[PDB]
């Protein structure tokens, strides 16, 4: 017999496909998939904080302050935000939280409020601090009662609702969130009986801002058995800005209001039902955590930190080695 | 396969060859074996980590989607935002998804060559003091020990050395 | 003087070129266009259904009911609409319909309305339901007339204008757009004489919307000679959804109203003819009756249309390098 | 070419091989001809099929402009939606017209090496029975049948039963 | 004996590009096609000049604020630089409302042509000469005002009546124009400058309406001012006519601008110096035939192509290995 | 290289051949040089200029960001823009970025692939009439005349001619 030598290539038991542009299917001995498809079905911290659970409360029940919502109340510290798709508690009281969706973008960018009284009670003189709340807003425990951070102001027993005037100057250096609101009674009666006779205005301003308004009296469908409404407001008192109130009449008051950290991560606002664990994350995104070193994903679009490119592909393998040709064994 | 030695003139792959992507299987008297060539086999994994390692890096930004609701007197910009995200989307799952076919195809072809060069290298090292057999084995026309078999994987065959005998086998036959 | 066997490749007689990286004007033995450049200048049903053609109307003028735009009034659907670029009938008597582009960007969503009488004219009580018509607004046969879809509201001869009120619970599956006015004399006098003496609001109210509005009493340049205005709003009212109207004076009531039932819409501007033709892919300048992938004609299509590029051909060499003999 | 075969060593192509793009032209007493090799050819068909069909797949999405109107407090948005569409514009149109090009040149160096490779299948049956011209022509130094040529195409060429015939003439 | 071999070109290059397989490839001939050099300047843009607003900024420039004075006449601009640290703008305190949109529509210009809209004389039996305020010097005078509003105010012994004025566009130019509404701090300070009773603010062309009224309450002082301004901007196109009504707290139009017709407003501190440019850039002009550039994505004129590359190299040359010597 | 030539079977390049990319060098009783091969240099002088040409006409559109300020109440369409704009950034970056790295590999393969159809031009003429020395060398067996040298060249190299002169030479040694 002669002596041979012969030139070939590695062959082994893979039987991992990728394809090209010639040809699909083609078996190779080494691959990388560079796509990730896994999740964890669920909620962590990510920077080691926790995010904010919103539980049965919407974004608005939160920081107007809805009775019901009394666990979230005060100081809040989050990496993000987690709103319930069927949380029930937001506004309790009827009618519209004006800019709502520049509120909830201006949210999702800050890291923490402090909560603080920014208008005490006593701001406002001559008129009933006390009297103001109502069935539509009830607490876990008295039927008849009204959001924490604001004050519905009625004129006392006398005929007269005085003008009345406050001040806070932002000496702070942090921007303060803070809300107010207007009150249109369902007809002519009620504005009587509630707030002085003849026109009503709501007026504020700041160096950089001006508002006004006046009272659209008219009746509405019953919402929470209420057929009157309530104008919601919100606005960004920055450092060393004065803020002036000055009203006749259907003022619904600032009365707490929050200090208020932009951050420098995104941040987000995930509207979702799945669990919050005590977990730490690289990668959350809105149906889950990522946990992968790869560099696409196709799990989803919407994420807070250091994600994989987003791609509507179910794979992305690469050869590596060669095509798989190896001996047919009987 | 584009250098047609893969799946081509050379037919199959050796399970034997466990040390290397490329190599050489040999028959002698003192024994027979696999042994991969190193240094062909190394500069591919080279080539190969580096071109994953540029994907991967070239791959390393990401379109961020946002969270942002729309009320119901913002349907054109809310469709304008659904319309630009889904348009870096479809960009990007097109670029991936291109980019792997085309990668692959080459990477197939790179193999292929560094095989075909492995075997016209020990071709033209052999001349005529070997025969091709086919399927790119080489039967020597001389004794080819262990020592002779290493010269040829390492581009140190004797030509000279073995003409004589070679030339008086070709012509026995 | 030795027999042969060559190896070797096909040539024959195309004269079909492509570019590549390396070379421009390479002719080769088979290829393929993947850009299509044809159109047919028309447009076509798209899932066998017909467009909507405005004709001489705008799409304001059309869904406000303007007096000329009957042919267009009641029932309506389709598979995308197409306004005439030079459409006279619109919005006849002068005023500003209220967040106008975001009621055209809903109106394309639809595919289909169903007009319906929102508010009978005996809603609203005390007043004139009779009288609100204007030489602003002629219909083919009458001098004086209003939009279908609204009702202009008046004193009734004997004074006052009193608090009127109507309300509507929509009942039914789908959303209803629907329309309203304010009226803007251009004088008191005007004012007194078709309103009260007093001031005059117009609030309407559902579960989830506010409005409120008052008149502004000036002169504005005149338009179809009228120096007075309407301003002009619409809403989407939601199933389950109830609206409450109250006003004293100077409403536009809402008269009519559309159920409106919501893929991909088009408004095309375009002067192009509509034909007794089906199509898949109809583009603004024309329906691509095609296989190919990419199109040059336009970006703004209904159905299943090619990917629009700027190219002018976009030709793959499938066979090799002709060289022919 | 890349693979040095088409508009190279081979200097042409043969408008009289009608039914394949790579194969083999033959003379002999017998006459002579044009023969497509099915196999390569169908080979290269079915790559060149898929190619395209992968692009046609992967070119399979759109971007879909909408001409919205947009007032005149909204020069800003009509703007940005304007810079948006074309810019999408702009990068299909740039994908588009680079791959046809990198295709392009791709397909011409793939049927070049195929003409390559069938070029040195043959040598390789042929060994020192027949002279390799420089022109992808082998010259016999046998007398080369009907047969003989089609077990040429057919990879069945049995070179030890011309050997001597062959070393006569080649030396003689 | 004697040889031949076949061989590849070498030389002394040590230039590198990098490949998918390779990094730092020393290649014989390579072209660089990105550009990451700039002059730091700004220039001319088709042999125009840019308007350099100096200490002041676009509000301040087009309001006409008494210290802007230095840019008060037609200027004609390729772009525009506003400084960051211009501090003369709006000088009595309030909101030029839609500010974003003005600043944009201002960008997409060429030339403006500044000219006397309404003369004083066009509002009868009111005083057209006392509407100034220390919140508005001129570097000459403590008290002064817009050049292009006149703040008008009752008469010394009088009533303030109703004032009208119309202006028709019979030009081929749109025209921009501003007005505003003055907020008294006060119920004293409204009486003392305008009549006792309900002030209104009415205008009007074919295609807009306005109406406002005073809004009267004590803000934060700014400049010395607890009162505000509401400033407004508009465009009158050609053929409308622009109609104005008002009974008190009107901040008229005095002078506009006939405003004519890619644009761009750059700020920055970069200095306008007497040369050319085909190519700038917010950070400086490029002077370059290269294909990409790092500089800025924010340009005018014709520039190349902008990305985050450091460099992007391409081999046209063989790889390069010289004999060792 | 991919091809095996560059860097490769053919060690290193010549800095005295300086009239083009591909060349032949000879050495003969009347004299040695490096001359290069006009026709295959010229040819791959055409391609490559045509790539950089090509790459540049499809690189000529520009996506253009803006200046355009945006109020405390539009956090969302001024978030919206500068996504929009670092997306087609970030989408045009890495189309350069990749391109470059892609066409690079591909130029040098393109070289490679030119030098190894030359070897094998003379390779194919010279047939046993020269003796393949390591390199990209080849000896001949018989004289080899300037003009002999001149049709290996272009392809005219007579065999037969020098067929005998070669044979006997070849084997006396
Ligand atoms: C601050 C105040 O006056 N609160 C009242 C409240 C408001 O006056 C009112 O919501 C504005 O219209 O009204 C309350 O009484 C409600 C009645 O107005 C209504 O007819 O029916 C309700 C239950 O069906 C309720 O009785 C309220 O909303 O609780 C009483 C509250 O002290
Ligand atoms: C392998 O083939 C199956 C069907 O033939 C297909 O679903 C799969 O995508 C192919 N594998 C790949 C893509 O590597
Ligand atoms: C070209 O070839 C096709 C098929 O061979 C033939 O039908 C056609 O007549 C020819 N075209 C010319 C040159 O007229
Ligand atoms: C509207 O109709 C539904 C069902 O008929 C009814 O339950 C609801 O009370 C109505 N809404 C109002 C408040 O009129
Ligand atoms: C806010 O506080 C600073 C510091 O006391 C003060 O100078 C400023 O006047 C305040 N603002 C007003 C309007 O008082």
């Known amino acids: 017999p002669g002596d041979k030598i012969c030139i070939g290539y590695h062959a082994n038991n893979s039987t991992t496909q990728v394809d090209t542009l010639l040809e699909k299917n083609v078996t190779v001995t080494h691959s990388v998939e560079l796509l990730e498809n896994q999740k964890?079905?669920?909620?962590?911290?990510?920077?080691?904080?926790?995010?904010?659970?919103?539980?049965?409360?919407?974004?608005?029940?939160?920081?107007?302050?809805?009775?019901?919502?009394?666990?979230?109340?005060?100081?809040?510290?989050?990496?993000?935000?987690?709103?319930?798709?069927?949380?029930?508690?937001?506004?309790?009281?009827?009618?519209?939280?004006?800019?709502?969706?520049?509120?909830?973008?201006?949210?999702?960018?800050?890291?923490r409020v402090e909560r603080f009284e920014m208008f005490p009670?006593?701001?406002?003189?001559?008129?009933?601090?006390?009297?103001?709340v109502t069935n539509a807003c009830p607490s876990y425990t008295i039927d008849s009662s009204f959001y924490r951070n604001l004050v519905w102001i009625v004129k006392t027993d006398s005929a007269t609702y005085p003008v009345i005037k406050g001040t806070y100057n932002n000496t702070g250096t942090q921007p303060i969130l803070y809300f107010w609101g207007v009150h249109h009674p369902l007809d002519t009666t009620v504005q009587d009986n509630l707030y002085g006779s003849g026109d009503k205005y709501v007026?504020?301003?700041?160096?950089?801002?001006?508002?006004?308004?006046?009272?659209?009296?008219?009746?509405?469908?019953?919402?929470?058995?209420?057929?009157?409404?309530?104008?919601?407001?919100?606005?960004?008192?920055?450092?060393?800005?004065?803020?002036?109130?000055?009203?006749?009449?259907?003022?619904?008051?600032?009365?707490?209001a929050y200090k208020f950290v932009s951050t420098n991560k995104k941040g987000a606002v995930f509207k979702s039902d799945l669990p919050i664990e005590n977990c730490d994350a690289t990668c959350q995104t809105i149906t889950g955590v990522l946990r992968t070193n790869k560099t696409f994903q196709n799990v989803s679009p919407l994420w807070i930190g250091e994600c994989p490119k987003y791609v509507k592909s179910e794979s992305l393998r690469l050869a590596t080695g060669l095509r798989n040709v190896p001996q047919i064994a009987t | 396969g584009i250098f047609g030695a893969i799946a081509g003139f050379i037919e199959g792959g050796?399970?034997?060859?466990?040390?290397?992507?490329?190599?050489?299987?040999?028959?002698?008297?003192?024994?027979?074996?696999?042994?991969?060539?190193?240094?062909?086999?190394?500069?591919?994994?080279?080539?190969?980590?580096?071109?994953?390692?540029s994907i991967i890096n070239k791959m390393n930004t990401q379109?961020?989607?946002?969270?942002?609701?729309?009320?119901?007197?913002?349907?054109?910009?809310?469709?304008?935002?659904?319309?630009?995200?889904?348009?870096?989307?479809?960009?990007?799952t097109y670029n991936a998804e291109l980019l792997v076919l085309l990668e692959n195809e080459r990477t197939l072809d790179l193999h292929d060559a560094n095989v075909?060069?492995?075997?016209?290298?020990?071709?033209?090292?052999?001349?005529?003091?070997?025969?091709?057999?086919?399927?790119?084995?080489?039967?020597?026309?001389?004794?080819?020990?262990?020592?002779?078999?290493?010269?040829?994987?390492?581009?140190?065959?004797?030509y000279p050395k073995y003409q004589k005998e070679s030339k008086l086998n070709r012509q026995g036959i």
């Open chain 1, 203 to 256: 007026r504020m301003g700041t160096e950089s801002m001006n508002f006004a308004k006046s009272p659209e009296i008219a009746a509405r469908p019953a919402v929470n058995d209420q057929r009157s409404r309530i104008d919601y407001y919100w606005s960004v008192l920055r450092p060393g800005e004065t803020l002036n109130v000055e009203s006749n009449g259907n003022l619904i008051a600032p009365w707490y």
């Open chain 2, 14 to 53: 050796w399970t034997g060859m466990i040390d290397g992507w490329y190599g050489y299987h040999h028959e002698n008297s003192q024994g027979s074996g696999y042994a991969a060539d190193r240094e062909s086999t190394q500069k591919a994994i080279d080539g190969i980590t580096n071109k994953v390692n």
């Open chain 2, 63 to 92: 379109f961020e989607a946002v969270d942002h609701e729309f009320s119901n007197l913002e349907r054109r910009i809310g469709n304008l935002n659904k319309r630009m995200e889904d348009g870096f989307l479809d960009v990007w």
């Open chain 1, 121 to 132: 009670k006593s701001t406002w003189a001559g008129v009933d601090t006390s009297r103001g």
């Open chain 1, 40 to 111: 964890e079905k669920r909620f962590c911290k990510i920077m080691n904080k926790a995010p904010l659970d919103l539980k049965d409360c919407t974004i608005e029940g939160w920081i107007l302050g809805n009775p019901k919502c009394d666990l979230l109340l005060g100081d809040q510290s989050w990496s993000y935000i987690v709103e319930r798709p069927n949380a029930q508690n937001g506004i309790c009281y009827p009618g519209v939280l004006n800019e709502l969706e520049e509120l909830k973008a201006f949210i999702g960018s800050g890291e």
């Open chain 2, 116 to 158: 075909k060069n492995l075997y016209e290298k020990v071709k033209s090292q052999l001349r005529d003091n070997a025969n091709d057999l086919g399927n790119g084995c080489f039967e020597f026309w001389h004794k080819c020990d262990n020592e002779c078999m290493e010269s040829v994987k390492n581009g140190t065959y004797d």
